[PDB]
């Protein structure tokens, strides 16, 4: 079922691949070629994860507990080759399916953008999240030389991976790109709360008042911090902050081990050893 204003937008065409073959909607979803590919990439990957949970690390430890299900990457001894299915090969197949699903999702978004005649900012922004995932499971494992460097597929198990990778550098907070990425993450959250607040407070003002104006919006933050970025620019800023956070997060992890093996605080010794002090 479509929105009450949607029918006049359900136009034929705008596909990247497939033309009229898959150019249709299933319920609310647009399918297209990459809807078919993406759905069955996701369906296979999800089913393989369930199968990976069905056999578990072994029969004794096997669990369907949603927190404890974990599909682990191969051992590092397998290098960049393919591992047996029960020894990390399933993880490698799921990773391929995940890449297939994520990219197909982005390309399906491109076809939707073409149908609606809008900018391609959303698929472009989604590519940053995909790029971060690709860095974690492809770029970094290849730079290190083994698929086993990828994180396991498990709701809690991949937190143990993050924890131990962080402590492979003894104090991960000192990673400079990590510090930059967190600053962008924290600033983005602050900017999002500010933007959500301003729009809501202007369109839902005090009782007995009419809807406010864009003049009120500029004045409000000028009255608080002396500057207003503007109605258009806050969306530029929000996109910039979120994308910079992910870009620098991708940088921080890809330099942690491939381009830096020491403890992260030791990296700052370049500044401490400047001859000025």
């Amino acid at each position: 079922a479509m929105l009450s204003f949607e029918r006049k937008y359900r136009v034929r065409g705008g596909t990247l691949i497939g033309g009229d073959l898959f150019d249709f909607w299933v319920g609310p979803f647009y399918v297209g070629f990459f809807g078919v590919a993406g759905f069955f990439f996701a369906l296979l990957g999800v089913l393989l994860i369930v199968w990976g949970a069905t056999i578990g690390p072994n029969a004794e430890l096997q669990t369907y507990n949603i927190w404890q299900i974990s599909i682990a990457p191969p051992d590092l001894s397998y290098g960049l080759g393919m591992a047996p299915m029960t020894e990390g090969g399933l993880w490698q197949i799921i990773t391929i399916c995940a890449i297939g699903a994520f990219v197909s999702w982005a390309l399906r978004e491109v076809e939707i953008c073409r149908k609606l005649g809008i900018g391609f900012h959303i698929p472009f922004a989604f590519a940053f999240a995909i790029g971060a995932y690709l860095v974690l499971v492809v770029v970094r494992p290849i730079l290190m030389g083994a698929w086993g460097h990828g994180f396991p597929y498990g709701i809690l198990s991949h937190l143990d991976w993050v924890s131990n990778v962080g402590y492979q550098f003894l104090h991960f907070h000192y990673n400079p790109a990590h510090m930059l990425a967190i600053t962008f993450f924290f600033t983005n959250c602050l900017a999002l709360s500010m933007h959500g607040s301003l729009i809501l407070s202007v369109t839902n003002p005090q009782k007995g008042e009419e809807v406010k104006t864009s003049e009120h919006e500029n004045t409000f933050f000028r009255d608080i911090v002396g500057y207003s970025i503007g109605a258009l620019a806050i969306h530029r800023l929000g996109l910039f902050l979120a994308l910079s956070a992910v870009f620098w997060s991708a940088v921080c992890i890809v330099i942690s081990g491939p381009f830096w093996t020491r403890g992260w605080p030791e990296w700052w010794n370049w500044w401490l050893e400047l001859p000025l002090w």
Partner: protein, 318 residues
């Protein structure tokens, strides 16, 4: 390529807007507004004016006192050597009172200065909250920003005041320093058994991740429909244009459901607010009702088990 609306190609100049008139009796806005060309490239060119009222003045005075105390103690920690101050600046800090002092006021260099900096900074933040409330009230606006700020203040108070009082120890609180407060963050997680297994830490991350996801989604969405005037969201809320329709239709086709031009900002507001709400709750639960988060996770079947390929003989079991 097509205009991506990332940078303003041709900027427009008008007389500086003084701002929407304030209610009678309010103080005038200070600062002669100026235009910055580079600020206008990405956003608005006008800088200023600002409203610096009675509340803002007190917040600034309280805030400077706290900041001056912190920076003075950092300088004292390097024995007044300004060169060594610059070299070690990231490592310097005003450090909380020692564990043996409990909640009592210790001598100045043993936590006394930290308490003053903590109190003065807290007062300035609280006064700044009143300022954000007053600025919205003076413009006839709702108090969404002051609520969201109060949520952030709740987390801030949980870190440095409420949790230390509940543990009865100022030594639990956060040092005033760049690397020192990162050391505190790591030590907090280590001390209380891997904060990754704190479910409210999990929730806070989900909302922090969601804040970036939503602003990337919403920021890209508005820019994608800004060719239809999607940036003018008040217009699209009161008079739904093709920008709001195409924005909603894009997301309905992508993920089967969508928001509205107004409700997306409610999703945004709550996602950011819940980041600090659950962060505060997770901090308040840690060390008070949960000692070891990993062991709490084991008790509740959250922590996965791994095959024992490596193990250590426990020397205490001898």
């Amino acid at each position: 390529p097509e205009y991506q609306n990332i940078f303003t190609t041709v900027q427009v100049r008008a007389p500086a807007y003084p701002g929407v008139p304030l209610p009678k009796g309010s103080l005038p806005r200070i600062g002669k507004p100026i235009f910055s060309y580079w600020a206008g490239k990405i956003g608005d060119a006008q800088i200023g004016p600002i409203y610096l009222g009675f509340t803002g003045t007190l917040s600034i005075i309280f805030g400077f006192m706290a900041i001056f105390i912190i920076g003075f103690n950092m300088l004292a920690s390097v024995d007044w050597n300004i060169i060594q101050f610059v070299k070690h600046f990231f490592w310097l800090g005003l450090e909380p009172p020692a564990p043996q002092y409990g909640l009592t006021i210790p001598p100045l260099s043993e936590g006394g200065w930290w308490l003053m900096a903590g109190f003065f900074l807290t007062m300035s933040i609280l006064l700044w909250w009143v300022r954000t409330y007053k600025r919205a009230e003076a413009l006839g606006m709702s108090q969404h920003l002051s609520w969201a700020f109060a949520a952030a203040i709740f987390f801030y108070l949980s870190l440095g005041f409420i949790r230390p009082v509940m543990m009865g120890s100022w030594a639990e609180a956060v040092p005033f320093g760049i690397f020192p407060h990162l050391d505190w963050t790591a030590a907090f997680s280590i001390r209380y058994g891997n904060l990754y297994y704190n479910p409210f830490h999990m929730l806070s991350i989900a909302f922090l991740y969601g804040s970036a996801l939503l602003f990337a989604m919403h920021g890209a969405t508005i820019l994608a429909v800004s060719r239809f005037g999607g940036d003018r969201e008040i217009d699209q809320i009161t008079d739904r244009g093709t920008a709001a329709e195409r924005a909603a239709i894009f997301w309905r086709w992508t993920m089967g459901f969508n928001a509205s031009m107004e409700s997306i900002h409610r999703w945004a507001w709550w996602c950011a607010v819940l980041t600090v709400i659950t962060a505060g709750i997770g901090i308040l639960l840690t060390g008070t009702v949960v000692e070891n988060w990993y062991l709490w996770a084991i008790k509740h079947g959250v922590a996965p088990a791994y095959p024992e390929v490596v193990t250590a003989v426990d020397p205490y079991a001898t």
